[PDB]
Amino acid sequence: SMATRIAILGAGPSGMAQLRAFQSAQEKGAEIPELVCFEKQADWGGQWNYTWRTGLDENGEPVHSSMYRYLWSKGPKECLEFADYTFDEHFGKPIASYPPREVLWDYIKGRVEKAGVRKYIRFNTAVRHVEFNEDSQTFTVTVQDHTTDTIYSAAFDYVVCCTGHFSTPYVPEFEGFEKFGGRILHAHDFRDALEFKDKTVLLVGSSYSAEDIGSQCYKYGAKKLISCYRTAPMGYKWPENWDERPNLVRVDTENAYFADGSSEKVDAIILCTGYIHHFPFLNDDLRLVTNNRLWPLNLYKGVVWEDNPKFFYIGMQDQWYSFNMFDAQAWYARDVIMGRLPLPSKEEMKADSMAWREKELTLVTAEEMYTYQGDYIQNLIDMTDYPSFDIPATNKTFLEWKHHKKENIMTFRDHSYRSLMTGTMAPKHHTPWIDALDDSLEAYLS
Amino acid sequence: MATRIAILGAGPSGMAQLRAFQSAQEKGAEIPELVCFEKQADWGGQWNYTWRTGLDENGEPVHSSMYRYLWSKGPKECLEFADYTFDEHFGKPIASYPPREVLWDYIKGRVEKAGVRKYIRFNTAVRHVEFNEDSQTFTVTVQDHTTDTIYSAAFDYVVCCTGHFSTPYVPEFEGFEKFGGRILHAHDFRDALEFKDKTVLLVGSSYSAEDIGSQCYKYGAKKLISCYRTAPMGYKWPENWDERPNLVRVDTENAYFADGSSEKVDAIILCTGYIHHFPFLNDDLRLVTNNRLWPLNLYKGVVWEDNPKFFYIGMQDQWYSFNMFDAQAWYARDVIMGRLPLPSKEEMKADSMAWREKELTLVTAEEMYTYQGDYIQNLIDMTDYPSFDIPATNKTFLEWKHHKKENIMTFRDHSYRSLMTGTMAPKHHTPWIDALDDSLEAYLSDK
Ligand SMILES: Cc1cc2nc3c(=O)[nH]c(=O)nc-3n(C[C@H](O)[C@H](O)[C@H](O)COP(=O)(O)OP(=O)(O)OC[C@H]3O[C@@H](n4cnc5c(N)ncnc54)[C@H](O)[C@@H]3O)c2cc1C
Ligand SMILES: Cc1cc2nc3c(=O)[nH]c(=O)nc-3n(C[C@H](O)[C@H](O)[C@H](O)COP(=O)(O)OP(=O)(O)OC[C@H]3O[C@@H](n4cnc5c(N)ncnc54)[C@H](O)[C@@H]3O)c2cc1C
Numbered sequence A: 001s002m003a004t005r006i007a008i009l010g011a012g013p014s015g016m017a018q019l020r021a022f023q024s025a026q027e028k029g030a031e032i033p034e035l036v037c038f039e040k041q042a043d044w045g046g047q048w049n050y051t052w053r054t055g056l057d058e059n060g061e062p063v064h065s066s067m068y069r070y071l072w073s074k075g076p077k078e079c080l081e082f083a084d085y086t087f088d089e090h091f092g093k094p095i096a097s098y099p100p101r102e103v104l105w106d107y108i109k110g111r112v113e114k115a116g117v118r119k120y121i122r123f124n125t126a127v128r129h130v131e132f133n134e135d136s137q138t139f140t141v142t143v144q145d146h147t148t149d150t151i152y153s154a155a156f157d158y159v160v161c162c163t164g165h166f167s168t169p170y171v172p173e174f175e176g177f178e179k180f181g182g183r184i185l186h187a188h189d190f191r192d193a194l195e196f197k198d199k200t201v202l203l204v205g206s207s208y209s210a211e212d213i214g215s216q217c218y219k220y221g222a223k224k225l226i227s228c229y230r231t232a233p234m235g236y237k238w239p240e241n242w243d244e245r246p247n248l249v250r251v252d253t254e255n256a257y258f259a260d261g262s263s264e265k266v267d268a269i270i271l272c273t274g275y276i277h278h279f280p281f282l283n284d285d286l287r288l289v290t291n292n293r294l295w296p297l298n299l300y301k302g303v304v305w306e307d308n309p310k311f312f313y314i315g316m317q318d319q320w321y322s323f324n325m326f327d328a329q330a331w332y333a334r335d336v337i338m339g340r341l342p343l344p345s346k347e348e349m350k351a352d353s354m355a356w357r358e359k360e361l362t363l364v365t366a367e368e369m370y371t372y373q374g375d376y377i378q379n380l381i382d383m384t385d386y387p388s389f390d391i392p393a394t395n396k397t398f399l400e401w402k403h404h405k406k407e408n409i410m411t412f413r414d415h416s417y418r419s420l421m422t423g424t425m426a427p428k429h430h431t432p433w434i435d436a437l438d439d440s441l442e443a444y445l446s
Numbered sequence B: 001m002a003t004r005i006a007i008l009g010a011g012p013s014g015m016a017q018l019r020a021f022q023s024a025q026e027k028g029a030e031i032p033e034l035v036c037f038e039k040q041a042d043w044g045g046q047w048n049y050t051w052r053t054g055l056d057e058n059g060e061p062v063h064s065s066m067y068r069y070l071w072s073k074g075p076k077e078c079l080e081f082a083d084y085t086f087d088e089h090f091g092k093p094i095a096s097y098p099p100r101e102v103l104w105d106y107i108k109g110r111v112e113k114a115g116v117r118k119y120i121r122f123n124t125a126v127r128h129v130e131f132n133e134d135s136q137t138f139t140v141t142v143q144d145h146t147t148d149t150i151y152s153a154a155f156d157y158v159v160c161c162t163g164h165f166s167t168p169y170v171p172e173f174e175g176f177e178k179f180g181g182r183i184l185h186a187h188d189f190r191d192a193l194e195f196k197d198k199t200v201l202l203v204g205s206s207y208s209a210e211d212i213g214s215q216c217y218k219y220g221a222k223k224l225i226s227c228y229r230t231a232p233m234g235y236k237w238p239e240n241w242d243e244r245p246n247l248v249r250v251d252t253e254n255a256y257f258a259d260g261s262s263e264k265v266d267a268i269i270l271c272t273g274y275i276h277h278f279p280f281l282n283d284d285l286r287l288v289t290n291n292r293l294w295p296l297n298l299y300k301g302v303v304w305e306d307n308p309k310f311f312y313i314g315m316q317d318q319w320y321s322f323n324m325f326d327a328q329a330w331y332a333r334d335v336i337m338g339r340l341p342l343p344s345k346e347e348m349k350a351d352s353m354a355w356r357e358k359e360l361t362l363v364t365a366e367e368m369y370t371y372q373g374d375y376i377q378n379l380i381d382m383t384d385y386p387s388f389d390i391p392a393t394n395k396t397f398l399e400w401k402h403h404k405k406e407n408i409m410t411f412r413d414h415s416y417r418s419l420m421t422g423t424m425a426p427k428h429h430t431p432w433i434d435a436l437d438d439s440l441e442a443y444l445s446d447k
Helices: A013-027 A087-091 A101-115 A208-219 A323-337 A346-362 A366-381 A391-407 A441-445 B012-026 B086-090 B100-114 B207-218 B322-336 B345-361 B365-380 B390-406 B440-444
Strands: A005-009 A034-038 A125-133 A138-145 A150-156 A158-161 A183-186 A200-204 A224-229 A242-246 A248-251 A255-258 A263-265 A268-271 A311-313 B004-008 B033-037 B124-132 B137-144 B149-155 B157-160 B182-185 B199-203 B223-228 B241-245 B247-250 B254-257 B262-264 B267-270 B310-312
Touching (some): A005 A013, A005 A125, A013 A034, A087 A101, A101 A441, A208 A224, A346 A366, B004 B124, B004 B149, B012 B100, B033 B124, B086 B100, B100 B440, B199 B262, B207 B223
Parallel strands (some): A005 A158, A200 A224, A224 A242, B004 B033, B182 B267, B199 B223, B199 B267
Antiparallel strands (some): A125 A138, A248 A255, B124 B137, B247 B254, B254 B262
């Protein structure tokens, strides 16, 4: 109805938030651009759409989801609630604070099922190339539609990139991998923990993947777990059959050797070494290059590409906050696309981003980090009609979560926190984490 | 010479393409400028083994489907280069079914001698090829992973040598989303010892199934089941390996089959083939076909009929391999160089149709490899590729077929005669089943 045409790449949480932002503005009576969203999977959800598939999907594209069986929320759900679609509204009842994948998946779909935005999406279509033409001032987006096996392009006035940054593995090599006889994989290819039942598992890395894949491995009966770190130990007090050591240095037919001179028989090695920002459809003029951090550079307000401000990136930061961060972002992007918030000059954009980067470098403690992100989110929601929830109250919730993890890393998921949107407190779940062997939504909600 | 060629990939076909040009210039011709792009850090293609699975370190798809303990699948006598013999490379006779590392060494040998490595830009992935109608040139856009830059270059011709056995065809079966063992495609199979003392289901009834089964067996898998969609492999298997009708569904631990059987299974390996997948090509340049002896739209099986400045090498199914690619690369070379002019689109189409009509006739393995030999024969008669004896190579194939029928676990223990040198291969020092060391070093010593 407005003259322009927008392309949204990806229908993960960020892609869905972006459609939702437009749908919301129009429901309040605005005229909005034409929307096309492209998604390579057959259904929306992004990471949350679980697949048994590993490696390359059935059309030959990279498998996107890194999620595995038995995965549950990693932080209080109370911290990732939508300000415009509460947990109360979706579920009709109170539920525990750390829901399984399927439940959280259900929740986010619910919002966009209600919004009726599914119709903007062309599923099973992979983005191949985006180019900007200087003379028309438009982007040409080329895609492959895998349902018809045709490749075609279309012209757009703005492009919002919502393709995530936790799907292309960073996989470093260690000496002797070419002759190790057990399995080597990246966290990205981890599926069923029962595959590692009665086995000795090495996890390389000291971040969330290593904490969590370790825990699932443990909880489903891995015989022994070794996890090893490059910089500093995770530092949690692990179960009896799990130990932390200095980094792996080499491997041979059955054995792993470590930097402290230890050595051990190992059955499988899981690289929990993170991901890279990888945009294979973008040229150097549009393509973001960064490591995982709270403040990537060259994004104004963390979302506008400074070299071509008709291009936007959603959710490319590291994530303490997640779902409502993407909303705050998508709402911003929407508003600038729609002319409601004009942009400053390239010089001020750069100055502003530099200030944000300066402060990022200041940050030492987990507490400072999520607060920094809250400060960021706060800035965004103040500029748009996103409902402004209570950021400091969400920070306390993060703080409590931090503590519970320290107390006992195996039972942090058994606690409860209060919604910052509704005020409702979460009930205890009906089963302790360690004993809830059934990841299904059906079991979680009975 | 005025023009500029882009060669995509430095596997056996890419290397053959470089070698054809180098050869022509060694006999005194002026050749085009050459750029070859390879995404891996070394040449060899499938033969360059990687422990990596899924996506490689730059984020590109892992290319090699090869696994530890792999050896040649047919007589080496059948895949010898007519211009670089096994005798010349190795300085001695060797057995007929060499390991991966040994064949790898042999093909690199030819191009190390030719000095063509300097044309290649390694660690560079091809992203897009476009043809511009107004300049009549191709713009090839690539990412260099050493510098992390994306750039383009203009070319007059493009030869595509990126292979067709690297993007898995992976079908879904009911209940995969809840099975608790591993699911993988043959593409991701690396060490057989990962399946020691385990029960392994192999879905499929072709070469991957035969060979991944055999490796699994030979390295001590407890039990093997292999199931087929159309017809059984039909070989007489070991005692802990059986063939059944197709898998229908799966649950937490169990596999159920079409004949009503059911079994506890540890790992499922899909041995279901690959797809021709060219993610850098638009519909005007992109070949779409299933695995076969005669894909359609390739004139002489190499020239893209819709834009004859674009060429495809090694896109057929492979009885013959390495010297088929040479026959082709030499043909492509000669057309690109002006030595062989092309007919009209109409005759290209008519000729291709005739070849396809015959491909539909083929029933027996013997007819199939003979067809391919007829095809190869046609190509080498048009270029100065040395014409070896195709009928003699056909016999070798035929003997190989027999040995496989007699005993599927000892076909690799036989020996055949080179069709290039006449030399007969010696017996290997170790029976296949007992040769647990896949290394070049072990294969070439005398114990
Ligand atoms: C293993 C794991 C566990 C996590 N757990 C939690 C958690 O418990 N809590 C939490 O808050 N966050 C968690 N996260 C963070 C997660 O990043 C966010 O929750 C959320 O998934 C961000 O979604 P997104 O839309 O930005 O990207 P994604 O969820 O990755 O989705 C991006 C979309 O882009 C599509 N796409 C990509 N490339 C193309 C292409 N070339 N063409 C077409 N479409 C394309 C993908 O198919 C996908 O649908 C987890 C992440 C991982 C990897
Ligand atoms: C598991 C397996 C076992 C086999 N065993 C035998 C055997 O024993 N005997 C036999 O005769 N044949 C065998 N083959 C057949 C095999 O196809 C040929 O031997 C030979 O490897 C074909 O070489 P190629 O150059 O055509 O393709 P490939 O060997 O696949 O090489 C193609 C090259 O293209 C490069 N490439 C692809 N995409 C890009 C890109 N986008 N950008 C840059 N570079 C790219 C690749 O990295 C690779 O180097 C086997 C095949 C498989 C899968």
